[PDB]
Amino acid sequence: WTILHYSPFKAVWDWLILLLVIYTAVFTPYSAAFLCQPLAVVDLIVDIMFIVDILINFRTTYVNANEEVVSHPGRIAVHYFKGWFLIDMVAAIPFDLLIGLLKTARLLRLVRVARKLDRYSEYGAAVLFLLMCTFALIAHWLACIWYAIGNMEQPIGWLHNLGDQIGKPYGGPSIKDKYVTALYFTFSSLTSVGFGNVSPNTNSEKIFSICVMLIGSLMYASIFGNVSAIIQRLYSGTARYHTQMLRVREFIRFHQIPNPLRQRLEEYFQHAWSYTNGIDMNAVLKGFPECLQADICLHLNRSLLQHCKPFRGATKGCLRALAMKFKTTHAPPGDTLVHAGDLLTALYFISRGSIEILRGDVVVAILGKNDIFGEPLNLYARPGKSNGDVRALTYCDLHKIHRDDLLEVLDMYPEFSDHFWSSLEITFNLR
Amino acid sequence: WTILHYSPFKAVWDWLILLLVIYTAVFTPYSAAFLCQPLAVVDLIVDIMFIVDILINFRTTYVNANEEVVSHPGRIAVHYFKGWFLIDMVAAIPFDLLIGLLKTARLLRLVRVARKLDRYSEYGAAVLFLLMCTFALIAHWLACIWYAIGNMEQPIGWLHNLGDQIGKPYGGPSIKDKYVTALYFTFSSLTSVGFGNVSPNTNSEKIFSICVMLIGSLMYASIFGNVSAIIQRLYSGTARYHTQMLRVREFIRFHQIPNPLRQRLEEYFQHAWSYTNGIDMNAVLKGFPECLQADICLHLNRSLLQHCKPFRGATKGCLRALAMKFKTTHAPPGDTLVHAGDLLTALYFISRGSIEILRGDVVVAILGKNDIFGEPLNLYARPGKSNGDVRALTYCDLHKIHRDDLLEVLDMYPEFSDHFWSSLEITFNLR
Amino acid sequence: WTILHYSPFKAVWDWLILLLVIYTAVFTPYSAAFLCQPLAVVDLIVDIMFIVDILINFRTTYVNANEEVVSHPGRIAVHYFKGWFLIDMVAAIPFDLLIGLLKTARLLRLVRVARKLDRYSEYGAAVLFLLMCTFALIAHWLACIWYAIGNMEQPIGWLHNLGDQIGKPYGGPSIKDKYVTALYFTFSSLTSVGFGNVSPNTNSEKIFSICVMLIGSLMYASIFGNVSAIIQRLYSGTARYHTQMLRVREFIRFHQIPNPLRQRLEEYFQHAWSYTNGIDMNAVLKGFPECLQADICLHLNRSLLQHCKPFRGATKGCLRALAMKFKTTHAPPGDTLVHAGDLLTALYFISRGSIEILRGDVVVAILGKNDIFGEPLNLYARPGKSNGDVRALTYCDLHKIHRDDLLEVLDMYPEFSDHFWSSLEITFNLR
């Protein structure tokens, strides 16, 4: 019969609790210093539905360190005892039995909503909103204290001055002005502007003004600190880019690096940063553990999977392995690559874009949409030149495999080995 | 007969010294500018127990660079000579012989308590408390100077104004107001609020006001700096989390990564951060040197140690080695793992949670509480399929060993080799 | 017939749009609160050439996610629909049909120029300029609001005071002063100075003053944050240097390191930082991918390329490989190096500067401008002493090759192998 903690009714009740705690923390001091009808009825019903709230909290489940969800509300009751339930019960104790400073349950209400603050937090802007709200609350409380001192002093205080400036000599100013100027002065000394209209005269309010000045210093410092933290948290990525560019620049100017090579170097730098944004995908790929690593590497194989006929007959373990074994090589359009007379151990398949192969003005293999070039592997097995030089074109996203890696991964399973060698499709074997 | 330095009586004496230095640094200027009875007796007894203090310091031990504790108080005396003992002796010299500016020993008292400041420091909040205290002290001294200038000017100064606002025209205001307004004004120009009630009129106090404004600028900047440093020191961990998530997000959106695979990737990300909190435990494990490394790796072996019968007969060196050789593999509930037709060199034991093994809808080995599966090792020694696919369940905390590592670590000691192969317990050998 | 987006005429039009939006956002409120002729003609022509602007935007090309440049202006039109074109069309709708608050199209103009803000940004100083500009705009708007409240209150407000201080009792002050003091007061509460000349008296302007104080707090915090971010972004490189120096110092006085060794260590440290500036060139060299890596490593080979006769006959692949295989070794003047009786596998060529070779006061090989020393390789192949010790001189930039690396890279191609061994030029083979 017990309700669960994440029930939406509980959340709506929590929002109503927040509204009511704000209401009481705002109206109790303002009525306590400055100040029949159903307002007392509302005040008592506040305590009543907070008693209802503790009843619900015993009814609804809680989250323990061991058990996130547990039944048997008696356990919830014994967990709440000697803790926040004592606070919320003091908040649920009527104190009607004037003397308004005994309404300290309202501050316990704010303590328990501060217990709910972490749930309320989603991003950094909400933090700024909460800081502004507590700024306003501190201001209102200090204004109530200031008005209380002003009343006590009058039997030369700021009240007589106020009677003089806004013309109501003493009569007396209305309760509207008698609070607006209080709040005005509380900000006048909290954000450190300090106007000359209202200013302390006798001793007590000078002591109070010292206290307000110190509080303002502290909290204004806190606001600066948080705002600076956020702004730096974004200019951190900004500075990452700037330091990357600076290191590149330092290398370039250190070794002279005449105009052609340099310009290719920097243009490649912005080309890289355009998509990698400084962070390499290789490191984060290695961070993900084995099986997930293969799976995310398997997603990149929507290119050679379906277009290679032998690949279809392969077993899924072979798919995963031979998939992780590939290297999809990015290169910006307009690159020259492996020459003739080099090693042939760097086996190459075609993955994306299009490239042309110029061996002494002999352009061949103008393909590039999931095609294949390279060397035979059974008999040749000889490093050297395949056909000759390659020539630059549009997107040079090629497909690196190794001549030792492919063999070691392939020879463990001879059935797909044979099925692979039988359907040896090469769009243009450069010989 | 000598006392040692860390005696509690010495610490209590140090606290009393702190109380007395605060007392003197507060009351000497206030009596010097604004101002029979035992107060002179108290002032002289101050010097007396500071002489007692230097006597104790010669009696009690000190900490040298070479010897932390040394006897023979003569060595302590020769070490103190020409140094802080000269300062504390000047502080222990009576200057009774008005002229109150000669009481410069009080500032040396503050210098020597600043020597004790590092001991007083425990965390960052104490730093803020000390900054607030020195703020108050600077304020009090500047207020005393301000009152002195005010007295000198009166033969138009702020004193006559003060006589005019709080009604005591000249008579004259009481010594209570004649100091409260001084402190009020000193804050008025130190936290940069600048009220209009009291303000410099003649030339001398305008020069003084310039000096106060500059001092306030400097120290207010210092307070902002420290508070910002602390707040950034916490949002550092915040930003670490945010940049980790950002790199993950960038990888995800770079390579498309359709909804199923992506959602598993991020959910695994929060699962990891839930307990690792960004920092990998592997790095800190490798940081700890060899023997401690094995010992802390030995603590993780409360799982396979007592439940493996052959393990009990093993020698402790074998325990340490074979313990460091394991890899306790974390995996969140709901993971698929090594298939059939793969390599068998990845030997696997059961460490925590529970998992099920589905080879073509054939679920076997539903164990998982410190159990064992895998392949025989003596005769088989062949990569391939063991039984087939595994199926996802609750906590997938498995137990990686290697087929080359275990052999190389085990074959160095044939007695436990034989005892191990004899008691070859496997809860379900997947064949 | 369509114009392209990057046409200079479009950029000049954008600059004119910026000028006109500034003009309107400045003059519309000032005329709306404080305030025949062609000014209405100018105001309407503003809307007219903004209609012209949307016509051009449909005519000129745009940049899509897939296509950077696309023809067929109908596509541009359908892309603009339901988006920024609605905003710019509301800005292009005349509202002549007093009531000046309906001119909300001017704020949409500022929104769309904020869309162009990223293009306007080049560095950080422009950011500070834009922040100052928006500061001025906020000030002007708040001054207009303040003047409006002042007019409303007059049927004790600040207007009567203004009539009293600058002598024009009521008559009334000219519209020049009636605005200069407004702006004066708006800064008086925005940068938190708070003069006493003009200050709120009745209730409405006290509420307004509270609002201004809060806005000033926020934006002043923002300015501090940005400036601190930039200054820290430079002292970051400063602190990098300092932390390198500190680590060096830590190592120095941990291990004593008497004066000769210490001094050579720090002098080498400053020598290194003089040109490497902390960042190693090795890391950035490895960062650049293969082909570019070789090409930039090939640029360093303007030293041994043209002066080695066998090198000329070599094939370009051999050039690239044997070029990447070298290590140009930096060493400051005044270094001692490999002794006799050591290994000879560290083959050494001469790259820059000059050095002396002293084997028992026998100085030989006073060369160093692209010269060669070392050992024979065909028959000798023996570790040991070559001739003996070296002697320090000016720039010790030597040329490391390996005795296994050179062979493995050279033996793959026997034609240049033979051509190399035939022209075996060694300026002084130390035997």
Add this chain to the structure above:
Amino acid sequence: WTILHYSPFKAVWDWLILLLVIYTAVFTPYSAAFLCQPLAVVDLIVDIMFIVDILINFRTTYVNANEEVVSHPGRIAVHYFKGWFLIDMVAAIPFDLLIGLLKTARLLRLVRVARKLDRYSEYGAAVLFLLMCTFALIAHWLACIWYAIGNMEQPIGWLHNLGDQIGKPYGGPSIKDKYVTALYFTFSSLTSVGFGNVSPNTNSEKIFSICVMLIGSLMYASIFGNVSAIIQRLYSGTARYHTQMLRVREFIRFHQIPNPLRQRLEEYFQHAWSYTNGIDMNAVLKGFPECLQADICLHLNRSLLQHCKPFRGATKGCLRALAMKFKTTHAPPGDTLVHAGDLLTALYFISRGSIEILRGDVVVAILGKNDIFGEPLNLYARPGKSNGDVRALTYCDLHKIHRDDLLEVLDMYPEFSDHFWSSLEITFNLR
């Protein structure tokens, strides 16, 4: 006959130039706004010795990009032409031919001393001093401008008020007050305090006040930024320590790690941080290149060098190699180490402190001051137990060598091989 640039006379001349530029930049405006005798003689002699200065600069050497020191002052002259020499010559042109704003050469003097600012910089405190100095200069200039406006307005400005407050009604205040209040007001609006004694009344000084407020905002922000940068630059090391401790703590509480082992872990952590301070010495050891690396590693060999008799006959290359081959192992007092039944390939010598060897309550080898234990190497060559367990004592700074490393480094030179095996001193070979 030419003087060199680093001559001390040149430095003394530079200091005199600094004094004179400060003098002129201070007195020229104060004479120009507020204000026979040799002061004109001094003013002209200023230009005279600045002409002398440019004469010296042509005489003395300069530093070029290629040549740090070069003779032939004609080259210095042609280098100075069309550059800073034009500025210094304009500064060396007399403008006597009132109008005091034409003395713009004084600002060029400040520009050229700003060229010398980098030389003046040694640390961060000098930066703060220079910022304070330029703060004072900006204040003085703004005060001169303010006084000029005040004079112009008088034919209700602040001058009449000043005549009223300090009693000198108009007569008029002395030139002392007529400047002290100017500086007072310039700070009143620059550090954002804003007193009420002096305040703008007519339009001109309100515009000026707006400008001053903006300048104060900017420069006050700059001061905050720099101070925060320095304070963060120290709390950076603070935060390094804190994050190290945090990672250690997270590992500790993640894996439970019961009290004995945990306590050993943190006590070792503090012991490490006591001397390494987070900075690992291995990294900086590997950072220093080869020869210097061996030399600084050779300094650690004042322990086994002189006490090993065979070591003396060794060749210096063997010294260097066998020295770099060692590992001086730090361990805090109270550690247990390699047991029996383990591998013997970890050869161990005694380096520092003292340790005891307990094999079944059989304590042997109580040495430790540059002594030797271990196993024979010629015939034994068998992993296993040497004698048995070791027992904890004071400083466990032991001496790691390897059984493969020592052989491979030793067998390249058989003469010291034989001399080593002949004088095979082992203080206690644990058998």
